[PDB]
Design a protein around this ligand. Structure first.
Ligand SMILES: NC(=O)c1ccc[n+]([C@@H]2O[C@H](COP(=O)([O-])OP(=O)(O)OC[C@H]3O[C@@H](n4cnc5c(N)ncnc54)[C@H](O)[C@@H]3O)[C@@H](O)[C@H]2O)c1
Ligand SMILES: NC(=O)c1ccc[n+]([C@@H]2O[C@H](COP(=O)([O-])OP(=O)(O)OC[C@H]3O[C@@H](n4cnc5c(N)ncnc54)[C@H](O)[C@@H]3O)[C@@H](O)[C@H]2O)c1
Ligand SMILES: NC(=O)c1ccc[n+]([C@@H]2O[C@H](COP(=O)([O-])OP(=O)(O)OC[C@H]3O[C@@H](n4cnc5c(N)ncnc54)[C@H](O)[C@@H]3O)[C@@H](O)[C@H]2O)c1
Ligand SMILES: [Zn+2]
Lengths: 373, 373, 373, 373
C-alpha cells in the first residue's frame, strides 16, 4: 500500500556526501580556505561548474501542480510527492541527481521569470505536470531563453515514445508512411506535439479530432484556442465527428478520454487498423474489445496490457544525453531518440516497442541524444 | 589541493534512492498509480508533505553570489561551488538534505518573490552569501512572509557564535554585562546583527565603528546607509576614530579588515581587554602580537590559532531544530542557541568555546532551538 | 507490517562509492596502476590500513545462529536478517559500516579460527546471537588472540545497559548498594555477565537463579556447567527455588523465560521492589500485572511498555569509541559506558534510562568509552 | 597521486541505510519484534534470504594476499586496499554490493573451510589475487562444495576475455579455428585456463610454453607441477624453446614476463600473426615494435595501447548474472560470456573487442550469463 510505504520512508529523495568522515583537513579542501579557489575558477569561467560541481549531473523537476497526473490543478503541495516520483525515476534509470521544485505561482510570465533564474544551479530542467495551453508558451520561451536543456515529458516525452511505437507498427502494417490516414483524438498537451511529429516524420493525411469534432479551418467551432493544427492537417478537408474521421483511417492515436471509441467503428477503418488508446486511466476503447472488433495492433498507456507506451522509455536518456552534451534540446535530438527507441527491438504485434525496464533502451537513447545535434 | 579534489569528485552533492533494485512493483507505489493518493493527501492538507515527502528534512541554500566569501560579487556560477560546500556541512553535521540554489537575479524585490515560491519544496531556507545592505530587507521580508524557517548565516549565524564567545569571555573577565564598553568594528552583514545581540543580551555601552569612525547620529558622515545602529548605540555620545573608541574599552569585536588595530592602542583599553579579531583571512590585529601588547583573551576567525569563532557551531543545530519544530526562527530560539553553545564547555583563556567537531555542541543547540519558542 | 516492508526494501543494507560516475582517470587512481602503491604501504606497515582503507570504520557482525533473539538455534540463514538489523543500527547510531557475517559452523574452536582470519578486513568484531556457554570461551579467546576490539552485546552490551538501569532505579529506591538483595534469574550469556557487573559495581548480596533453583556451591545439582557464579554469589548461603530467593529481595533482574514470576511472590519482596523483566518476547511477568501487584519500578526488553532496557543504547557508542582508540574492550571502558548511559538523563519511576533515539546518549557513551582505558 | 587520494577518502566503500531518520516505528519493523518474523521465515526456508535480505545482491571479494597484482605475496593487509578496488568496480559496473574479505590464513585446506562457512552471508564469492598453484584446488573445491557461485578473475575471468579477443582476431585473420597453431607462453593461473578454453572452443594445435620451454610429456623437465597441460596439447609432439614453438605459429598469447619475445622471431610465424602480449606491467614485446616487425594484430593488458584485454569486461556481468540466477558458474555460462563479449562490437585490427566503459557490453554479458545454464 502506497500511502503507508510513503510515511514510512519519509521521502523518496536523499543526499549523501562523498567522503565518510570530516576533520580539519576535509574542510580545508571542500570548504574555506580551499573552495575559494573553485569560486575564483567557476566565476572566471562558468563551464567550469560542469567540472567542479554536480552541475553536469543535476536536473530540476519543475511543476506548479496545474495538471498533476489525471487529477487536475491540485496545486504544488499535491504535486510535490509526484515530483519526488519523477526525481526517483531519474536516479534509478539515468543515475541523474534530480531535485523536485514545486512552485507556488500559476501565472505563466512569472513561472518563466522564476525558472530562468535557476539556471546557475542545474544542468537541465524538466517541466512536469503543468497545464495546457500555458505549458506551450512556457516550454517554448524557456527553451529559447535558457542555455541548459528544457524538456517537458507530457509534451515532447509522449511524442517521442508515440512516434517510436507508430514507426514500428507502421512497419508491421507494411503501408507507406506518406500514404496512411492517422486520426489523432484529443489535441491537448500531448495531442498537439504528436501531430507535429507525425508530420515531421512523413505522414501526410493526419486528421485532428477534439471535443468539437474534426479540426477544420472552415468550421471555426472546432478551432477552440489558437492551437493552428487545423491549418497544417486535414488535407482531404474532411469534416464531422470522430466516427466520420475514422472512415478508411489506418491509425487511431487517442490521447483523450475513456470509452469514446465504439468497437463497431473499427470495422469502418482500412484493413489492419492500428489502435493506440493512450488515455489514462481508462483507454479510449478496451484493449481486448479492440482485438475482437478487428484491430491488428493495440497499445495503451496502462501496464496491464501489451505494448505500453510511456515516457519512461524516453526521458531518462534524452535528459541525460542533453545535460551532458550541455546543449539545448533540438528536433534532431528528439528524432534520434525516436529512431533509437524504435530500433531497440524487433517489432511484433504484441511487442512493438520494449518495456521501460530494458536497460538497453536507455543506453541506446542516451547514445543517440548524445551524438545528435 | 582544492581544485584537484573537486575535479576528481565531480561534485560534492549526490542523491540516493531508498530502494536498491526497482521493479514493476516498486514503481506502482512510488509513482503512478500509488503516488496518486498522496497527491490528494497533501493537496487537502499541505502539512502532510512533512509526513510523506522529505519536506521535513530538506533545506535550500539560497545565494545570488553577491557576497561570496571574501571574494565580493562574483556571481551565482562562482557561488555554486561554495553553496555545495554549505550543503555538505548540513549533511555532515545535521544529516540535513540541503540543496544549493544559486539565483541569477540580483534585484531584492525579485529575489524575495522567487524564494517565496519555493516554499512547497523545502522545510527551511538558508540565505547564504548575499551582500549588504539588501540582505537585511530580504532576510526580514522573507522570515515574515514565509511559513518555513528562514536563516542567514553571515548575519544570524555569526551573531550567535560571537555572543556565546562574548558571554564566556565576560565570565572570565568577571565584569558586569550592563557595565562594559564594547567596540564593534565593521558594521556590515555580521556587524549589524552582532550589535543588536549584544544589546538584547544586556550590554549597555556599545560603540559601533566603521570606515568613517564611531557611528553617531550627530555626525551624519558616519551614517552611510539607513543602518539606525547610531540611534541605539553610543550612549556616552562619543565621537572620533577607532583609536578614540578603544579608550577605556573592555571588548573589541572586529569583523572588518586586517591589521587595522595598532598593538599600542590596546594599552589604552581598560584592565584585561578582550580581543575578537574575527576578520578573514587577516585578523584586525595579529593574535600573538595581541597577547604581547596586553590582551587577556584573544580569538579569531581562523583555526590557525586558538579560539575559533565560526558559524559552523551554530547553523547545523539551529536549522535542524527549527525545520523539525516546523517554526519560524525567533529571537528566543536564537538566544537559546547562544546559551546552548556557551554552556557546552567550561571557559578558559585558550578555550572560551568548543570546536565545530565537538558533536556534543550540535546536540545541545539542536535541543535548545527545538525546545525554544 | 514487518514481513511486508522487508521484501520491498530487498535488504536493509547497501553500499555507496565516493564517486558518482567513474571514468578512465578515476580507475587509474582507485585501482591498478595507482592502488598498487597503497598496497605496498599496507604490506609495509599493516597499521596504515587505517589511513587508506575503511578498516578504521568497519565492523563485522558475527553470528552462527545458535542463539538468535529468543528463537534459539535457528541457524545462520535465519540469523542473517537479524544481523542486517544490527548492522543497520550501527550505521544509524554510530555511522559505522557494519557488515553482517553469518557462519555455518557451530564448533567453537573453528568459529574462533575463522574469525581470527578476518582481522585484516575489519577494525572491530561484534559477536552476536551466539549461544552459551560456548560464547564465553569464544569471546575470551578472541579478545585475547586478536588485535582489533571484540565485543558481544548479549554478554557485555546487556550487562552495561542493565547496570545503568539498575543504578538509576537504585537511586530512586534510595537504598544502599552494599545492602540490597538482587535476584538474577537466568544465568546465561547475559545472566553470567550481569552478576559480575553488579558485584563490580558494589552489590554484596546477589542471588543467582536458574533452571535448578538458587545456584549454591553445596547443591551441585544447580551447578550445571563450570559457570563459578555460585562461588562468588549467594552470601546468606540460601537455597531453594525462585519464590524462595525473592523473600526480602529488593530487585529482580530476569533475563530468562516468560510468565514464570507469579504476581503474588512480589508482595513477599521488601518495600518498593524493582522488577526488570527483560525476557523476550514474553517478560518474566506482565509489566502491568507487576505494577498492580506492588512494583515500585518496572522495565522490559520490549519497546511497548515504558523503561525499555536494550543493548542499542550501548553497542553503538562502545563499539565506535573502542574501534577509534584502536584498543581492546576493557572493564574500565565498559564501566565508563555504564555511568555514561545512567547520567544521560534524570531518573524517574517511568523513565530510569533514556530511549535508544536520544542521540545524546550515543555521544555520551562514545565520549566515555573513548576517554576510558 | 593514488596515495594522497586514498588518504583523503579514508575508504573507497561505504554502507548506507535506505531510510533516513529512525523513529520508534522503524525499529519495530527493521529490528525487534518485527525482524523476528523475518528471522523465523528465513530459518524456515533458506532461499527466503534472497527476498528479505540484501543477500541477492551481495558478493564477497576474498583474498589471502598471496598474489596481489604483480607485487607477489604481500599479505592481507596489503591486499585490503586492492580488494576495496575490486569492490568498487563491482558497484560501479554491476551495482553489486561487494564486501572485501582479506583472510590471514595461507594454508589451502583452511582457506576452503573458512570460505565455505561464509555462504549464509553472500550470494556469490569472488576469489581474487590468490597465488598458484593452490588457487586451482581452492577454486575447484569451493565451486563444487558451495551452493552460491564462485569465480576467480585471474583464472576464469582472464580466459573469458582472452577467448573473446581471440575469436574476433581469428575472424579478421580468416583462418580456420581447427587448423591454427597457437602458442601460449606462461602456464600460470591464467595460462592454465586459457589453454583449456582454446581447446574447448575448437583450437587443435595449442603449444604450451613455460620457463623450461615447450611443455612435453616426454621431457619431464618441462613438466614442473602436476599441471597435465602437456597431455592435452602439443599434438605435433614439438620440443624446444619459445623461438622453436613460434615457427609457423598463427597466434602468440603471452601471459608471462616482459621483453622475452624477440621482434625477429615474429617473421618466422605464419602470415598475419596475432600477438597478445598480456604481461603486466611490461608486455612480452613492445606493442609498437610488434607492428613494425610484421604483426597483423596486437593486444596488451595495458590501457595506453589499442585492444586492451582486461577482466573488467567479464566479471561485472558474469558475477551479476550468476548471483541472480542463484546458480553455480558453469562452462556454458562462461562460453556464453565469451560469445557475448565478442559480438558486442564489429571487430577491426585496432579494435577487436570493446572497452570496459562500453556499458552495452556489461548488459550483453549479464544477459548471456543469466540466460545460460
Ligand atoms: N502521452 C502519454 O505518455 C500519456 C500517458 C498517460 C496518459 N496520457 C493521456 O493523455 C491525455 C491527456 O493529455 P494532456 O495532453 O495530458 O491532456 P489535455 O488535457 O491537455 O488534452 C486533452 C484533450 O482531450 C480532449 N478531449 C476530451 N474528451 C474528448 C473526446 N471525447 N473527443 C475528442 N477530444 C476529447 C480535450 O478537449 C483536450 O484537447 C489523457 O488521455 C491522459 O490520460 C498520455
Ligand atoms: N562572522 C564570522 O564567523 C566570520 C568568519 C571569518 C571572517 N569574518 C570577517 O567578517 C567580515 C565580513 O563581515 P560581513 O559582516 O560578513 O561583511 P560586510 O562586507 O557585510 O561588512 C564588513 C564591514 O566592514 C567595514 N569596514 C571596512 N574597513 C573597516 C575599518 N577599518 N573599520 C571598521 N569597519 C570597516 C565595511 O565598510 C563593512 O560595513 C570580513 O572581514 C570577514 O573576513 C567573519
Ligand atoms: N589475464 C589478465 O587479465 C592479466 C591482467 C594483467 C596482467 N596479467 C599478467 O599475467 C601474468 C601473471 O599471471 P598469473 O596467471 O597472474 O601468473 P603466475 O605467476 O601464476 O604465472 C606466471 C607464469 O609465468 C611463467 N614465466 C615467467 N617468465 C617466463 C618466461 N620468460 N618464459 C615463459 N614463462 C615464464 C612462470 O613460470 C609462471 O608459470 C603476468 O604476466 C601478469 O602481469 C594478466
Ligand atoms: Zn542480540
Amino acid at each position: 500500500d502506497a500511502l503507508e510505504l510513503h510515511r514510512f520512508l519519509k521521502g523518496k529523495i536523499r543526499t549523501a556526501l562523498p567522503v565518510e568522515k570530516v576533520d580539519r583537513e576535509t574542510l580545508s579542501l571542500l570548504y574555506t580556505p580551499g573552495v575559494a579557489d573553485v569560486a575564483r575558477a567557476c566565476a572566471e569561467d562558468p563551464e567550469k561548474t560542469y567540472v567542479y560541481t554536480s552541475r553536469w549531473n543535476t536536473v530540476a523537476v519543475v511543476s506548479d501542480g496545474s495538471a498533476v497526473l489525471g487529477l487536475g490543478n491540485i496545486g504544488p503541495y499535491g504535486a510535490l510527492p509526484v515530483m519526488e516520483g519523477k526525481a526517483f525515476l531519474f536516479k534509478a534509470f539515468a543515475d541523474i541527481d534530480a531535485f523536485p521544485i514545486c512552485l507556488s505561482e500559476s501565472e505563466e510570465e512569472k513561472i518563466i521569470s522564476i525558472v530562468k533564474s535557476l539556471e546557475p544551479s542545474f544542468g537541465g530542467i524538466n517541466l512536469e505536470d503543468i497545464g495546457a495551453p500555458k505549458c506551450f508558451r512556457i516550454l517554448q520561451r524557456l527553451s529559447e531563453e535558457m542555455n541548459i536543456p528544457v524538456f517537458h515529458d507530457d509534451q515532447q516525452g509522449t511524442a517521442v515514445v508515440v512516434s517510436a511505437a507508430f514507426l514500428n507498427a507502421l512497419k508491421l502494417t507494411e503501408k507507406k508512411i506518406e500514404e496512411v490516414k492517422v486520426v489523432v483524438n484529443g489535441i491537448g498537451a500531448a495531442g498537439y506535439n504528436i501531430v507535429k511529429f507525425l508530420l515531421d516524420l512523413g505522414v501526410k493525411n493526419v486528421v485532428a479530432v477534439d471535443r468539437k469534432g474534426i479540426l477544420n479551418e472552415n468550421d471555426p467551432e472546432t478551432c477552440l484556442n489558437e492551437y493552428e493544427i487545423a491549418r497544417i492537417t486535414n488535407p482531404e478537408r474532411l469534416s464531422g465527428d470522430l466516427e466520420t474521421a475514422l472512415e478508411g483511417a489506418d491509425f487511431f492515436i487517442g490521447v483523450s478520454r475513456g470509452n469514446i471509441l465504439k468497437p463497431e467503428w473499427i470495422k469502418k477503418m482500412s484493413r489492419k487498423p492500428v489502435i493506440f488508446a493512450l488515455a489514462n486511466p481508462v483507454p479510449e476503447i478496451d484493449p481486448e474489445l479492440a482485438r475482437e472488433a478487428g484491430a491488428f495492433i493495440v497499445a495503451t498507456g496502462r501496464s496491464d496490457h501489451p505494448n505500453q507506451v510511456n515516457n519512461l522509455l524516453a526521458f531518462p536518456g534524452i535528459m541525460k544525453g542533453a545535460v551532458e552534451k550541455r546543449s539545448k534540446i533540438t528536433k534532431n535530438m528528439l528524432l534520434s531518440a525516436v529512431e533509437a527507441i524504435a530500433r531497440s527491438c524487433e517489432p511484433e504485434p504484441e511487442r512493438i516497442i520494449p518495456e521501460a525496464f530494458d536497460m538497453k533502451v536507455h543506453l541506446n537513447v542516451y547514445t543517440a541524444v548524445k551524438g545528435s545535434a
